[PDB]
């Protein structure tokens, strides 16, 4: 299937305490593999997955330098943006950046991304063509003109389409046991009345990987998205994911409903149905 | 692998 590599950066200015808090995190698909936190004693890019610890000290040193360079650029940006938005030195402000790769089932480049946000809103993004910039407002125009004069897109074009995929391929190979696996969801179903003539049947999907999964009920053919309020997919904490859907119905009959689960780890889509 | 180029101040 498809895969991706993404880097997320957040810098928050704390005027009064000290330098901004900076936190960087890297992911391959739904797996975090590295992190950096400006407030940690470490002051190094650290691994968060076994397969990345195989990279030598040269790699780590390089990643550490780059990530710190990212941090200091965000520091300069925070000071520039106040100016642009004519804001004071008092409040706390946030700068976020994200970029990465998408490859298909053949591991070839599908698309790249490089986006930047200020105080939670889009500030400037690189378009799908990897050559044009989408500047949200007037301040962002100043930035797009300076990034155009320096050919930032062309540089990102080289990184997103070449380096990012080359390393995405490398990581998928080195961490094949983890990244190319597929954990099928373990499922079960509970049931207990809330009052006479009322009972909530609840379906579960646990320990599954990747995170992409569909959990829907059916009396028969849905036809449209049913009113069943499904909880947002969440991380188990051990690298897997979980998600449950629940329905209230007439106590008596309970064979009217059937929970359906669809995941990449399952060849045939599951169809659970039991009346406790 | 972090980007080692194309990263500039706004």
């Amino acid at each position, epitope marked *: 299937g498809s895969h991706s590599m993404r880097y997320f950066f957040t810098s928050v200015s704390r005027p009064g305490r000290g*330098e901004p808090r900076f936190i960087a995190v890297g992911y391959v698909d739904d797996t975090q593999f590295v992190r950096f936190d400006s407030d940690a004693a470490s*002051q190094r890019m650290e691994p968060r997955a076994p397969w990345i610890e195989q990279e030598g000290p*040269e*790699y780590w*040193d*390089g*990643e*550490t*330098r*780059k990530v*710190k*360079a*990212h941090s*200091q*650029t965000h*520091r*300069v940006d925070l000071g520039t943006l106040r100016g642009y938005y004519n804001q004071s030195e008092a409040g706390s402000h946030t700068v976020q950046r994200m970029y990465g790769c998408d490859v298909g089932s053949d591991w070839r480049f599908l698309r790249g991304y490089h986006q930047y946000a200020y105080d939670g809103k889009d500030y400037i993004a690189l378009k799908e063509d990897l050559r044009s910039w989408t500047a949200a407002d007037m301040a962002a125009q100043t930035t797009k003109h300076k990034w155009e004069a*320096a*050919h*930032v897109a062309e*540089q990102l074009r*080289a*990184y997103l389409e*070449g*380096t990012c995929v080359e*390393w995405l391929r490398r990581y998928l190979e080195n961490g094949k046991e983890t990244l190319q696996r597929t954990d099928a969801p373990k499922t079960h179903m509970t049931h207990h009345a809330v009052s006479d003539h009322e009972a909530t049947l609840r379906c579960w999907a646990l320990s599954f990987y990747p995170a992409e999964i569909t959990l829907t009920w059916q009396r028969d053919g849905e036809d449209q998205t049913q009113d069943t309020e499904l909880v947002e997919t969440r991380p188990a904490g051990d690298g897997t994911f979980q998600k449950w859907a629940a329905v209230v119905v007439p106590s008596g009959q309970e064979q009217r409903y059937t929970c359906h689960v669809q995941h990449e780890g399952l060849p045939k889509p599951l169809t659970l149905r039991w009346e406790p | *692998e972090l*980007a*080692g*180029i*194309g*990263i*500039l*101040t706004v």
Partner: T-cell receptor, first 109, second 116 residues
Framework: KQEVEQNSGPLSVPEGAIASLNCTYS??????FFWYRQYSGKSPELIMF????GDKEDGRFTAQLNKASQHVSLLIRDSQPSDSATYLC?????????FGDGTTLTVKP | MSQTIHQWPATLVQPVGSPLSLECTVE??????LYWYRQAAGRGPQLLFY??????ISSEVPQNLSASRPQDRQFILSSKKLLLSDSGFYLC?????????????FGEGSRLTVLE
């Protein structure tokens, strides 16, 4: 050192000929590359940089990048005695430049 | 039209045990990355210090040297007591803030000869 390898020379090239300088790097994650020219007693001066495969020409100078073999070249067209110097290859291995020891070029008039 | 970098002094001859103070100044950019390299004869420049606009980035540790940046565009290399080993050609360089292609140029260098 061994992160960036260049023959040391002196490499002789007749005046008017093309001088070709080669460089091999070992750091897989290198994303940009540079060439400097350094005359005896002087600091190095930037010739070019490149961050993409293929050739990049600037006047008489042409830089070539082949990431597959981690090879970087520099061709100097119409060599003159004035380009006698030590040419340094540098790789950007993360926020900084790491240098080869250079190849000394001598162009005979 | 005018991005510049200069270092001083150009040449120094000092005895073992004396202090060192090399200066590097830049002009035409703000918040640049500043670097101190040292070059030995027959060799490529070797990195000593890599400072971003707000502090040192390299974890590198030269034996008898220290760097400081008392101003955005002013960079200093010091030593309280020089070692013979400290003879070399000290080079300062700069690159635009962040990680890009702007800059990457050296000052004229400071030749240091420490004598026994």
């Amino acid at each position: 050192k061994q992160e960036v390898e260049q023959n040391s020379g002196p490499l002789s090239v007749p005046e008017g000929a093309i001088a070709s300088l080669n460089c091999t790097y070992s750091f897989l994650g290198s994303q940009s590359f540079f060439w400097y020219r350094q005359y005896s007693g002087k600091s190095p001066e930037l010739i070019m940089f490149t961050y993409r495969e293929g050739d990049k020409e600037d006047g008489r100078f042409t830089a070539q990048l082949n990431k597959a073999s981690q090879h970087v070249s520099l061709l100097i067209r119409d060599s003159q005695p004035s380009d006698s110097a030590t040419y340094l290859c540098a790789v950007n291995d993360g926020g900084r430049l790491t240098f080869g020891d250079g190849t000394t070029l001598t162009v005979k008039p | 039209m005018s991005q510049t970098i200069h270092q001083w002094p150009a040449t120094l001859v000092q005895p073992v045990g004396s202090p060192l103070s090399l200066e590097c100044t830049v002009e035409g950019t703000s918040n640049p990355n500043l670097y101190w390299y040292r070059q030995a004869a027959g060799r490529g420049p070797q990195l000593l210090f890599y400072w971003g606009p707000f502090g040192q980035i390299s974890s590198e540790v030269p034996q008898n040297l220290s760097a400081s940046r008392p101003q955005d565009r002013q960079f200093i290399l010091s030593s309280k007591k020089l070692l013979l080993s400290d003879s070399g050609f000290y080079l300062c360089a700069w690159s635009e803030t962040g990680l890009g292609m702007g800059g990457w140029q050296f000052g004229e260098g400071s030749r240091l000869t420490v004598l026994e």
